[PDB]
C-alpha cells in the first residue's frame, strides 16, 4: 500500500471541527463519550509490526542459497549407506560419516551466512520515547492528568513547555508558546503558534502542532484532530515498517552467481548420471558417482569466504568508527551511482554560528577554524573590539557553569539560537564572556519582540573611571540604519553619506544572497551633560533617545557547512558519483549551502538565476540551458513519476528543499528507478523511511536521533563525511578483491570434476576421492581465499568509473573462462600427472590404466595383473589408490601456490605490485602445513583415508605450477602492453 497524502482539516475553523466530532470547545468531552469513541477509533499506541520471525529466518536461509544440492548429496549418502547394508557385506561407515559431515557442512554454512543476512530493523521501539505517558487534558471543564494510551480524538489537550504533544491537534488558543518541530521538517528553529490559518499547506500552517513534538516555550491548548495509526508520523512509521528493504548489490550478484553455478552443477550432474546409467553401473555406483560430482563441482567452502571478507572489511573500517550493522552494506557504499544527502547535521554542525561580518566598509570572513587560519580578520582594531563588546552585551543567554572542560564550540547554552551563536562567536574571539558581563553591569534593558524588532540595554564602560552610560542596540539592519546618524570606523566617527548608505545596502544584499538573517548593531554613549549618572531609568516610560544613533556593524550567523565536507564532496563527485541534496528547509538557504559546500559548481546557475541575470521571465528561457536546478516542495505534489524521471535525467546537479518525508521517499525511489544505486545520509526521524529504501543508509552518530541511527545500514560514530568517501573507495577495493577471491576458489573446481570425468569416460581407477574433496575445499581454499581480502588493489582507483550495476557482474562469462577454461585445466593436468607418476612407480604403466577400472574396484578379484606382471589383491591395490588420492591432494596444494601467486592482482605483475601482503605468505605456508600434517598423521588413514607418500612425490606438481605462473605473467604482460584489445575483452575477469 502507498500512503503519501497526509491530509489534515486545517482550513476549517474551530467550531466546525468541534462539531464534526461533536466535542465541546470549552468543556472538553465526557467520560462516557470518550469511552464509546475509544471503542471505535482504538488506543493511541501505534501498531508494531506483527510479523516477528524468530528462527524461521535461519531455516529459510539454510534451505535456500547454494545448498539444496548439499542436502541432496547428504540424502544420497544416506541412501547409499542403506543400499550397502542390504546387499553388500558388513556395512562400512565411509558413507554414513560422509553424510553426517556433509550435513555438518550445510548447517555451518547456513548458520555462518546467517551472520551477514541479519535484517537489524527495530524501528518500532524508537517511537515509544516520544508521546509521553502522561498528558494534561481538559475534560468536563476540569484539568486532568491522563495516560497517553487511552486519550481519544476530540478532547481539549493543554500544551506546556517541554511536554511533547500526545496527538495531532489543532490549537484552539495559543498563549505565547514557541514550538520547534525537529521531526518532519528537521531543524532546531522554533516556530510560532496561532489559531489563524497562515498557510494553505497543513505542514506549514501555524494552527496545528504536529505529533511527537513539544511547544518549547510556553503553554497552549488545542483539540485533537487525529490520533493512532491515522497520524502523519504514525503513517510514516507504518510506511517505514511495510517498506522492508531492497536487495543489496552484493546480494543480487551472489544470488546470480549461485544460480549460475548451481545450474551448471545440476546440469553436468544429471548429464553424467544418465551417462553412467547408460553405461550400465549398479545403483550404488551411480549414486556414489553422483555424490562425487555434486560435492566436487559445488564449491561448499565459498559462501563462507565472502562472509569473512565482508567481516574483515567491517573490522578494518571500524578503526575509523563506522559501526556497520548490515554486513552487506560495506559493499553497497562502493557502488553508489548516486548519493542523497541531508541539510541539517550531515553537512552542517546543526547549530547556528557566526560566519560573516562587515565593518570599515569591508567584509570579513569569520573562521570556522579555531586558529583563525588565513588571517581572517584583525584583532587589535578599535572598531572590531567595540563590535565584540556590542555582540557580547546584547546576548540574553548564559553558559552553564563549570563546563570549561569542553571546547567553546561544543558547549550547550540555554537561550535563543541567534544570541547563542553571537555569544559563542564572542567567546571564541575575545575570551571569557562571563567576566565581560561581570565588568559591565546592567542597569536598564528593553525586551526583544517581533512587534519591536530591536532590543537595547544600558551598561557602563570597561574602565571604572568615567562610567559613561552606553546604550547597546541590536536589530534588523534596515531599522538600525534608519535610526543611525554616524558610522564608527577604526574608533573614529564619520557621518553618513548617500554613497555610504548605497554601499551599506549593497553589502546587506550581498549578505542576504547567502541565505542568512543579517543583524545590525548600534551603541550610543549618552552624554553626561543631559543624561548624568543619577538619571532615572524605566522600561514602559521612554526616557532615552531613539533616533540620531550610530551604526557600528552587520553580523551574519548562518549555520556553517562541515569542516571536511567540501573536499570530500568534491572527491565523491570526481569519482563519478552524482550528488543530490534533499531537505525540508527553505530553498534560499538550501541553494546557498549547496553553492558553499560544492554540490553546485562555480559557474553553473539555475533557471531563475539565468532569468534574473538576463532580466527575462523564467517562461521565456529554456530550462535545458541550466544544468543545475533547485525546486520547491510545493510543485512536487503536482509532479508524476515521468516528471521526476525527466528532472533526474536532464538536470545534472539538483537540490531539493521543503520536502515532506514521504516526498523524500518518492525522490529516492525515483532516483533508484533509473537503474542507479542510491545512498541517503541523514540524522532526523523524517528520513527514517527513505533510509530504509536506499540500498545503503548512513546515519550520523552523535548528531543523529536513535530512530535514524538504528534504521541505518551504517552509522558514522565520528560524524565525518571524509569517512564516507573513504568508505566508497574501500567498497570499490573490496568489490575488486572479492572478484579475485571468487575466481581463486572457483579454479580449484576443475581439478575436482575432471578426475570424475575420466573415471566415467576412460575407465581408470578413481583418481580423486570424495572426502579429500571436502579436505581440499575447506582446508586449502579457506585460509588463502580469506587472506586475498587484505591486499590493496592497483593504483588505478583514483581514475575509476562507478560500477555499472547491469554489465559488470561479480561473476561473468569472462571469469568462468579464466577459471574453468585455462587456470583450472592446468590444475587437473598436474593432478593427473601426479596420478600417473605414482601409479607408474608401483607397477601400473600409464598405457594400461585404460579399461582396468571394472576389475580394479571389484571386491571378488584378488589377482589383478598389473603391467609389470605381478598381481595385487583388493586392499593391497586400494592402498595404492588411497596413496594416489593423497598425492592428488598434495599436488592440488602445490599448484594452488602458483594459483594464489597469479590471482593476487588483475593487471600489475607480481614483479611490479610486489608481495607486500604479510598475510598471503602466512596463508601460503598454511596450505603446506595442513597438507603435510593431514597426510602424515598416524592413525588417520583408517578414518580420513589419507596415506603417507614418499618425499619425491611431493615434487610431481612443480613443473606444472611453474607453467601456470609463467602463462599468467605472459597474459598480464600482453594485457598491459595492449589496452582495450581482444585479450582484455575475453580474459580480464
Amino acid at each position: 500500500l502507498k500512503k503519501e497524502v497526509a491530509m489534515t482539516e486545517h482550513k476549517m475553523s474551530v467550531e466546525e471541527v468541534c462539531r464534526k466530532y461533536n466535542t465541546d470547545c470549552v468543556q472538553g468531552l465526557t467520560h462516557s463519550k470518550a469511552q464509546e469513541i475509544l471503542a471505535r477509533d482504538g488506543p493511541n499506541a501505534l501498531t508494531p509490526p506483527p510479523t516477528t520471525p524468530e528462527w524461521v529466518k535461519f531455516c529459510r536461509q539454510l534451505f535456500g542459497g547454494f545448498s539444496i544440492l548439499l542436502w541432496i548429496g547428504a540424502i544420497l549418502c544416506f541412501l547409499a549407506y542403506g543400499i550397502q547394508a542390504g546387499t553388500e557385506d558388513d556395512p562400512s561407515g565411509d558413507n554414513l560419516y560422509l553424510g553426517i559431515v556433509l550435513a555438518a557442512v550445510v548447517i555451518i554454512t547456513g548458520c555462518f551466512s546467517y551472520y551477514q543476512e541479519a535484517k537489524s530493523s527495530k524501528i518500532m521501539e524508537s517511537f515509544k520515547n516520544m508521546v509521553p505517558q502522561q498528558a494534561l487534558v481538559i475534560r468536563e471543564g476540569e484539568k486532568m492528568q491522563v495516560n497517553a494510551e487511552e486519550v481519544v480524538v476530540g478532547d481539549l489537550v493543554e500544551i506546556k513547555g517541554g511536554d511533547r504533544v500526545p496527538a495531532d491537534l489543532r490549537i484552539i488558543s495559543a498563549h505565547g508558546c514557541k514550538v520547534d518541530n525537529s521531526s518532519l521538517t528537521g531543524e532546531s528553529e522554533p516556530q510560532t503558534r496561532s489559531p489563524d490559518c497562515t498557510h494553505d499547506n497543513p505542514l506549514e500552517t501555524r494552527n496545528i502542532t504536529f505529533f511527537s513534538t513539544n511547544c518549547v516555550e510556553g503553554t497552549a491548548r488545542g483539540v485533537v484532530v487525529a490520533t493512532g495509526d491515522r497520524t502523519v508520523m504514525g503513517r510514516i512509521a507504518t510506511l517505514a515498517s511495510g517498506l522492508e528493504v531492497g536487495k543489496t548489490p552484493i546480494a543480487i550478484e551472489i544470488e546470480h552467481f549461485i544460480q549460475l553455478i548451481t545450474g551448471v552443477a545440476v546440469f553436468l550432474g544429471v548429464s553424467f548420471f544418465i551417462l553412467s546409467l547408460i553405461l550400465g553401473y549398479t545403483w550404488l555406483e551411480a549414486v556414489i558417482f553422483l555424490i562425487g560430482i555434486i560435492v566436487a563441482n559445488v564449491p561448499e567452502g565459498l559462501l563462507a569466504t565472502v562472509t569473512v571478507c565482508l567481516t574483515l572489511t567491517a573490522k578494518r573500517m571500524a578503526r575509523k568508527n563506522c559501526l556497520v550493522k548490515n554486513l552487506e552494506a560495506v559493499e553497497t557504499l562502493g557502488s553508489t551511482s548516486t548519493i542523497c544527502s541531508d541539510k541539517t547535521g550531515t553537512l552542517t554542525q546543526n547549530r547556528m554560528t557566526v560566519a560573516h561580518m562587515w565593518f570599515d566598509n569591508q567584509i570579513h570572513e569569520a573562521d570556522t577554524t579555531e586558529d583563525q587560519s588565513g588571517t581572517s580578520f584583525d584583532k587589535s582594531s578599535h572598531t572590531w573590539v567595540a563590535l565584540s563588546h556590542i555582540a557580547g552585551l546584547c546576548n540574553r543567554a548564559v553558559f552553564k557553569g563549570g563546563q570549561d572542560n569542553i571546547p567553546v564550540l561544543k558547549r550547550d547554552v540555554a537561550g535563543d539560537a541567534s544570541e547563542s551563536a553571537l555569544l559563542k562567536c564572542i567567546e571564541l574571539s575575545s575570551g571569557s564572556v562571563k567576566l565581560m558581563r561581570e565588568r559591565n553591569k546592567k542597569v536598564a534593558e528593553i525586551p526583544f519582540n517581533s512587534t519591536n524588532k530591536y532590543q537595547l540595554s544600558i551598561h557602563e564602560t570597561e574602565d571604572p573611571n568615567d562610567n559613561r552610560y552606553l546604550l547597546v542596540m541590536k536589530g534588523a539592519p534596515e531599522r538600525i540604519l534608519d535610526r543611525c546618524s554616524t558610522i564608527l570606523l577604526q574608533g573614529k566617527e564619520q557621518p553618513l553619506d548617500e554613497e555610504m548608505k548605497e554601499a551599506f545596502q549593497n553589502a546587506y544584499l550581498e549578505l542576504g544572497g547567502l541565505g542568512e538573517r543579517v543583524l545590525g548593531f548600534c551603541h550610543y554613549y549618552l552624554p553626561e551633560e543631559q543624561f548624568p549618572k543619577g538619571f532615572a531609568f524605566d522600561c514602559d516610560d521612554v526616557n532615552f533617545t531613539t533616533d540620531n544613533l550610530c551604526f557600528v556593524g552587520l553580523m551574519s550567523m548562518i549555520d556553517p557547512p562541515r569542516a571536511a565536507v567540501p573536499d570530500a564532496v568534491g572527491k565523491c563527485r570526481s569519482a563519478g558519483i552524482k550528488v543530490i541534496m534533499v531537505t525540508g528547509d527553505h530553498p534560499i538557504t538550501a541553494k546557498a549551502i549547496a553553492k558553499g559546500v560544492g554540490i553546485i559548481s562555480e559557474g553553473n546557475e539555475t533557471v531563475e538565476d539565468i532569468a534574473a541575470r538576463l532580466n527575462i521571465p523564467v517562461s521565456q528561457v529554456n530550462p535545458r540551458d541550466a544544468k543545475a536546478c533547485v525546486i520547491h516542495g510545493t510543485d512536487l505534489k503536482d509532479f508524476t513519476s515521468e516528471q521526476i524521471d525527466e528532472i533526474l535525467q536532464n538536470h545534472t546537479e539538483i537540490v531539493f528543499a521543503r520536502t515532506s518525508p514521504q516526498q523524500k521517499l518518492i525522490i529516492v525511489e525515483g532516483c533508484q528507478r533509473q537503474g542507479a544505486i542510491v545512498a541517503v545520509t541523514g540524522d532526523g526521524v523524517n528520513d527514517s523511511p527513505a533510509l530504509k529504501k536506499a540500498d545503503i543508509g548512513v546515519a550520523m552518530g552523535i548528531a543523529g536521533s536513535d530512530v535514524s541511527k538504528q534504521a541505518a545500514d551504517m552509522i558514522l560514530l565520528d560524524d565525518n563525511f571524509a569517512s564516507i568517501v573513504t568508505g566508497v573507495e574501500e567498497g570499490r577495493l573490496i568489490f575488486d578483491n572479492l572478484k579475485k577471491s571468487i575466481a581463486y576458489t572457483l579454479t580449484s573446481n576443475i581439478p575436482e570434476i575432471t578426475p570424475f570425468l575420466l573415471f566415467i569416460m576412460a575407465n581408470i581407477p578413481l583418481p580423486l576421492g570424495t572426502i579429500t574433496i571436502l579436505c581440499i575445499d575447506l582446508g586449502t581454499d579457506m585460509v588463502p581465499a580469506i587472506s586475498l581480502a587484505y591486499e590493496a588493489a592497483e593504483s588505478d582507483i583514483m581514475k575509476r568509473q562507478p560500477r555499472n550495476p547491469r554489465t559488470d557482474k561479480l561473476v561473468n562469462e569472462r571469469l568462468i573462462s579464466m577459471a574453468y577454461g585455462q587456470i583450472g585445466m592446468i590444475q587437473a593436468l598436474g593432478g593427473f600427472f601426479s596420478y600417473f607418476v605414482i601409479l607408474a612407480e608401483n607397477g601400473f604403466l600409464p598405457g594400461n590404466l585404460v579399461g582396468i577400472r571394472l576389475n580394479w574396484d571389484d571386491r571378488t578379484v584378488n589377482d589383478l595383473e598389473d603391467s609389470y606382471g605381478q598381481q595385487w589383491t583388493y586392499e593391497q591395490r586400494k592402498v595404492v589408490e588411497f596413496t594416489c588420492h593423497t598425492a592428488f591432494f598434495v599436488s592440488i596444494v602445490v599448484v594452488q601456490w602458483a594459483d594464489l601467486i597469479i590471482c593476487k592482482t588483475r593487471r600489475n605483475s607480481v614483479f611490479q605490485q610486489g608481495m607486500k601482503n604479510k598475510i598471503l605468505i602466512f596463508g601460503l605456508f598454511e596450505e603446506t602445513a595442513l597438507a603435510a600434517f593431514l597426510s602424515y598423521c598416524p592413525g588417520m588413514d583408517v578414518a580420513l583415508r589419507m596415506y603417507p607418500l614418499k618425499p619425491s612425490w611431493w615434487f610431481c606438481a612443480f613443473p606444472y605450477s611453474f607453467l601456470i605462473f609463467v602463462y599468467d605473467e605472459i597474459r598480464k604482460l600482453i594485457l598491459r602492453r595492449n589496452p582495450g584489445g581482444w585479450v582484455e575483452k575475453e580474459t580480464y575477469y
Binding site: 585455462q822 600417473f836 608401483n842 584378488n862 589377482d863 589383491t873 583388493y874 592402498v879 595404492v880
Partner: protein, 285 residues
C-alpha cells in the same frame, strides 16, 4: 531469447575464442604427453621402483566365487557348473600340451629344490627359461581328473595359488619345535600350508583335509621362484597346491582358513586376503 540472423548467437562469431581454446588444449595435451613420456624414461622395465606397497603376497584361490562362499547341490550339475567351468578355463593353460621343450619350457626339480635364479634383470639376456608344472602332480582322487573329474567327490578341489611378486623369494621358517606340527614337512624348500577355520570353537574339526601338490608335501615348491616379470618370463607357471575334503558334513556354514606360514610372510588386520586366505563351503542335498 538468443536471436539469430540479426547479429548472431550472443555476439561472438565463435571463431577467435574457439580457435584459442583448441590451440591451448592442443598445447596442453602436447606438454602432458611429453611429461608423461619423460616420466616413462626414468622408470625401469624390469622392476617396480617402489615394491613396498606390494607386501608378502596374498594367498588368493583359483576358483573364483562372488559371495566368497561355495554353495552347490552335489546331485545337480548346474549347481557346480560355474565352478567347474571356471576351474577348467583357468587350468587349460596348465595342460602339459602347452608345455614343451626346445626353449619353450624346461625340466625342473621334482623334489622341492633351492630357489634357483636365472640371471640379472638387465635385458642383455633374452627371455629366461622357467620350470614346467605338469598336471600329473595333482591327483589322490583315484581318477584322471586333471582339470577336474566333475563328480560330486566331496567338493570341487579349491586349489590355492600364492600370488606372484617380481623378484621375491619366499623364506621358509628354520627352527625346531615351532608353533606348527606337520607330520610330513621339512624346514627348507617347503612353505607349510594348513586349512582349518575357527578350529575347536564352532568348527570342531568337521572334516579332514588332504593336501596334494608338488613334492608330496603340503607346501609351495621354492625352485620356481623368483618371478622375473611379464616381459622377461612369458608363459610363466607358478607353484600350485591342491586341497580336498572327504569326511565333510552337510547343512552347516563352516568357515575354513587356509594360511601359509613363512619367515618372509607377514599378516595384516584390515586385509582379509593377504598372506592368509578364507573361504566358506556349503553343500546341501
Amino acid at each position: 531469447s538468443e536471436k539469430k540472423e540479426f547479429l548472431g548467437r550472443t555476439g561472438g562469431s565463435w571463431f577467435k575464442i574457439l580457435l584459442f581454446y583448441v590451440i591451448f588444449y592442443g598445447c596442453l595435451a602436447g606438454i602432458f604427453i611429453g611429461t608423461i613420456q619423460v616420466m616413462l624414461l626414468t622408470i625401469s622395465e624390469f622392476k617396480p621402483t617402489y615394491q613396498d606397497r606390494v607386501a608378502p603376497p596374498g594367498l588368493t584361490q583359483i576358483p573364483q566365487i562372488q559371495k566368497t562362499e561355495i554353495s552347490f547341490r552335489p546331485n545337480d550339475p548346474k549347481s557346480y557348473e560355474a565352478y567347474v567351468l571356471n576351474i577348467v578355463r583357468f587350468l587349460e593353460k596348465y595342460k602339459d600340451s602347452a608345455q614343451r621343450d626346445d626353449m619353450i619350457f624346461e625340466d625342473c626339480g621334482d623334489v622341492p629344490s633351492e630357489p634357483k635364479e636365472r640371471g640379472d634383470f638387465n635385458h642383455e639376456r633374452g627371455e629366461r627359461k622357467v620350470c614346467r608344472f605338469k598336471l600329473e602332480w595333482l591327483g589322490n582322487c583315484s581318477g584322471l581328473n586333471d582339470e577336474t573329474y566333475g563328480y560330486k567327490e566331496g567338493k570341487p578341489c579349491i586349489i590355492i595359488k600364492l600370488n606372484r611378486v617380481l623378484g621375491f623369494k619366499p623364506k621358509p621358517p628354520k627352527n625346531e619345535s615351532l608353533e606348527t606340527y606337520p607330520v610330513m614337512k621339512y624346514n627348507p624348500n617347503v612353505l607349510p600350508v594348513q586349512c582349518t577355520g575357527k578350529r575347536d570353537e564352532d568348527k570342531d574339526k568337521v572334516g579332514n583335509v588332504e593336501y596334494f601338490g608338488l613334492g608330496n608335501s603340503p607346501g609351495f615348491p621354492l625352485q620356481y621362484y623368483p618371478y622375473y616379470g611379464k616381459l622377461l618370463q612369458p608363459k610363466y607357471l607358478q607353484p600350485l597346491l591342491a586341497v580336498q575334503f572327504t569326511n565333510l558334513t552337510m547343512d552347516t556354514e563352516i568357515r575354513i582358513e587356509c594360511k601359509a606360514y613363512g619367515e618372509n610372510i607377514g599378516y595384516s588386520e584390515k586385509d582379509r586376503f593377504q598372506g592368509r586366505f578364507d573361504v566358506k563351503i556349503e553343500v546341501k542335498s
